[PDB]
Amino acid sequence: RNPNSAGAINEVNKFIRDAFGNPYIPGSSLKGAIRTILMNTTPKWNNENAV
RNA sequence: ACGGAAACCUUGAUUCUAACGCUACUUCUAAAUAAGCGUUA
Numbered sequence: 001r002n003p004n005s006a007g008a009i010n011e012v013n014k015f016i017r018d019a020f021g022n023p024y025i026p027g028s029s030l031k032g033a034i035r036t037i038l039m040n041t042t043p044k045w046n047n048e049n050a051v
Numbered sequence: 052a053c054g055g056a057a058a059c060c061u062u063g064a065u066u067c068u069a070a071c072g073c074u075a076c077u078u079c080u081a082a083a084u085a086a087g088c089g090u091u092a
Contacts, residue, residue: 016084026083028082028083028084029083029084030083031082031083032082032083032085033083034083035081035082035083036083
């Protein structure tokens with residue numbers, strides 16, 4: 001819709017920042033993505049024993 | 052008017068010198084601030 005006409009953008013989800021206000025990507029986020037990739041492609045972790 | 056009188060068990064002395072409540076030890080281990088959008092129109 002038009003951002004200056006209706007309610008439109010009421011809330012914006014903030015990006016992660018440090019104490020200086022500069023955005024960055026935490027290592028925990030990339031590590032979680034890498035861990036998902038590794039766990040899904042290892043047959044000894046992607047089995048019914050994972051539940 | 053007594054085997055009695057007179058006579059300090061007294062003076063000077065530091066329970067003192069030396070000695071680390073010390074040696075070794077990561078508040079550590081895994082962990083995406085992320086998932087779901089139905090039904091009506």
